């Protein structure tokens, strides 16, 4: 399962 | 054996041709198991391995929500980085990210990974401590500062040590008949005269899984690295891989050469010679 | 900033004339991701060719597999034609069952 709540660069 | 899970994201801008494409693929070891493509007619997470198909609707909804959100997030990231490098709106640019976990033979976390690249160059990476970052340049330092302020490393650590490992173990169990099966290479040596004076010996390895393999030629027991043509390991299309190694040898000296094969699926390492 | 594709053309199974097989064109080591790949039979583009989902290696370079069903014969010539921003003109790699 992929990472949640990923933040922008 | 040891296993890993990775997600690979590509976000590519294309000025004049719509919004940036976002594609995500997930792998366990050398087996792809899911894909998401913002360019699909109806973007949704799709299964790419039989053992993932048993996951419920909640799983697929969750994946798709994440990837749809990522599509927007990575578009903002592309805008940000264009600015960090003082680039015009005219060119196409690419952000790539790869992250995931490695497990040891014990099933425990060996290490976690999280790396990003911009236009094919390393940009920012999570260090092995899962607590600090390595920024490639002053642009990536801007990202690093933002990520430190937002506790992103802590977020990645929690994921890598928790959900990543927990789900990888689940996939490995559900797909045990394939993911935990090493298929040995089928091997043979072919002989191809190039002239009166020389001939090519080619050592073949076919139908193996996983892709990791060691293929080498020796002459009188001495490694022939510099004189060996070793093609990149290549996918057969049926989950398995192929590779070959070739050396050009003097006519009549063929028996001084041996091909050595190492692979997880083999009962024991192979030593092959040309058999006329 | 840009990397030209490596190209391998080969069959899924050992080639035997008259027996159905799969023709593969594997492009790898390239950047950026846009790439044009055609499989050819006697110089003519094969239709309905399928390909893998875009992914990349540890060094960030992209790779794709293009493939189609085919029946090798003595006379028929197969090849892969690749175009990429790094190439001045499309590169054609002929299928050689010995490689």
For residues B164 and B194, membership in a common domain is answered with: no
Residues B3 and B27 in one domain: yes
Residue B242 maps to which CATH number? Answer: 2.60.40.10
Report how far residue B197's alpha carbon sits from residue B58's, in angstroms, rounded to the nearest whole number: 66
Angle of CA points C6, C9, C13, to nearest 5°: 135
Task: State which of B181, B200, B227 marks the end of a domain.
Answer: B181
Q: What CA–CA distance (Å, rounded) separates B264 from B184?
A: 7
How far is it, in rounded angstroms, from Cα B191 to Cα B173?
Answer: 43
**Structure-determination technique:** X-ray
**Pairwise CA distance, residues C67 & C48, whole Å:** 9
Tell me whether residues A6 and B26 touch, CB distance under 8 A.
Answer: no
Residue C27, classified by CB atoms within 10 Å of its CB into exposed (0-12), middle (13-18) or buried (19+), is buried
Query: What residue spans define the domains of chain C?
Result: 1-99
Which of these, C15, C19, C27, C13, lies nearest to C87 by C-alpha position?
A: C27
Adjacent-strand bridge partners of B240: none
Q: How many helical (H) and strand (E) elements, i.e. helices and strands, does chain C have? A: 0, 9
Rounded distance, CA B172 to CA A2, Å? Answer: 16
Q: Which two tokens stand for residue C33?
A: 């991701």
- Chain B residues at the A interface, defined by Cβ less than 8 Å, are 7, 24, 26, 59, 62-63, 66-67, 69-70, 73-74, 76-77, 80-81, 95, 99, 116, 123-124, 143, 146-147, 150, 152, 155-156, 159, 163-164, 167
B171 and B200 part of one domain: no
What's the token pair of residue B232?
Answer: 């990149």
SS3 string of A1-9? CCCCCCCCC
- B101 shares its domain with B230: no
Interchain proximity B69–A2, CB inside 8 Å: no
Domain that holds residue B257: 182-272
Question: What string of DSSP letters covers C30-63?
Answer: EBSS--EEEEEETTEEPSS-EEPPPEE-TTS-EE
- Does domain C1-99 match CATH 2.60.40.10? yes
Tokens of A7: 């933040």
Both B75 and B186 in a single domain?
Answer: no
Tell me: do B170 and B251 sit in the same domain.
no
| B204 neighbors B190 (Cβ within 8 angstroms) | yes
Tell me the resolution in Å.
1.7
Tokens of B212: 């990791």
- Do the beta carbons of residue C8 and residue B240 sit within 8 Å? no
The β-bridge relationship of strands B270-272 and B186-193 is unpaired
d(CA B23, CA B9): 6
Q: Which of B164, B181, B198 delimits the end of a domain?
A: B181
d(CA C90, CA B147): 43
Which residues partner with C51 through β-bridges?
A: C66
Q: Nearest CA to C68 among C18, C21, C15?
A: C21
What's the sign of the alpha-carbon dihedral B20, B148, B118, B116? negative
Euclidean distance between CA atoms B137 and B123, whole angstroms: 7
At which of B143, B164, B181 does a domain end? B181
| B8 closest CB neighbour out of C28, C31, C55 | C55
Nearest to B37 by CA among A7, C53, C52, C48: C53
Q: B259: how many CB neighbours lie within 10 A of its CB?
A: 26
The encoded tokens of residue A8 equal: 């922008």
Number of domains in chain B: 2
| CA dist., res. B236 & res. B30, Å (int) | 12
CATH of the domain at B175: 3.30.500.10
Pair B142, B167 in one domain: yes
Pairwise CA distance, residues B5 & B266, whole Å:
24
């Amino acid at each position: 399962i992929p990472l949640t709540e990923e933040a922008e660069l | 054996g040891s296993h890993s899970m990775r997600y690979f994201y590509t976000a590519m801008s294309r000025p004049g041709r719509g919004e940036p494409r976002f594609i995500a693929v997930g792998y366990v070891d050398d087996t792809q198991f899911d894909r998401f493509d913002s360019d699909a007619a109806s973007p949704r997470t799709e299964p790419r391995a039989p053992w993932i198909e048993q996951e419920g609707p909640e799983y697929w909804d969750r994946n798709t929500q994440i990837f749809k959100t990522n599509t927007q997030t990575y578009r903002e990231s592309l805008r940000n980085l264009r600015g960090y490098y003082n680039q015009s709106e005219a060119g196409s640019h690419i952000i790539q990210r790869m992250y995931g976990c490695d497990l040891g033979p014990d099933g425990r976390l060996l290490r976690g990974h999280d790396q990003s690249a911009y236009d094919g160059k390393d940009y920012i990476a999570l260090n092995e401590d899962l607590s600090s970052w390595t920024a490639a340049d002053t642009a990536a330092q801007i990202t690093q500062r933002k990520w430190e302020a937002a506790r992103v490393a802590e977020q990645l650590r929690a994921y890598l040590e928790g959900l990543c490992v927990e789900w990888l173990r689940r996939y490995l169990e559900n797909g045990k008949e394939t993911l935990q099966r090493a298929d040995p290479p089928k091997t043979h040596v072919t002989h191809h005269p190039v002239s009166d004076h020389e001939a090519t010996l080619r050592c073949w390895a076919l139908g193996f899984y996983p892709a990791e393999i060691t293929l080498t030629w020796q002459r009188d027991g001495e490694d022939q690295t510099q004189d060996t043509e070793l093609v990149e390991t290549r996918p057969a299309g049926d989950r398995t891989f192929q590779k070959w190694a070739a050396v050009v040898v003097p006519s009549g000296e063929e028996q001084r050469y041996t091909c050595h094969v190492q692979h997880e699926g083999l009962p024991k390492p192979l030593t092959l010679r040309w058999e006329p | 900033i840009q990397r030209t594709p490596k190209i391998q053309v080969y069959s899924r199974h050992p080639a035997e004339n008259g027996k159905s097989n799969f023709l593969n064109c594997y492009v790898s080591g390239f950047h950026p991701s846009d790439i044009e790949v055609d499989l050819l039979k006697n110089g003519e583009r094969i239709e309905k060719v399928e390909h893998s989902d875009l992914s990349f290696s540890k060094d960030w370079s992209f790779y794709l597999l293009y493939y189609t069903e085919f029946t090798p014969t003595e006379k028929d010539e197969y090849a892969c034609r690749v175009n990429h921003v790094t190439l001045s003109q499309p590169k054609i790699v002929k299928w050689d069952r010995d490689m």
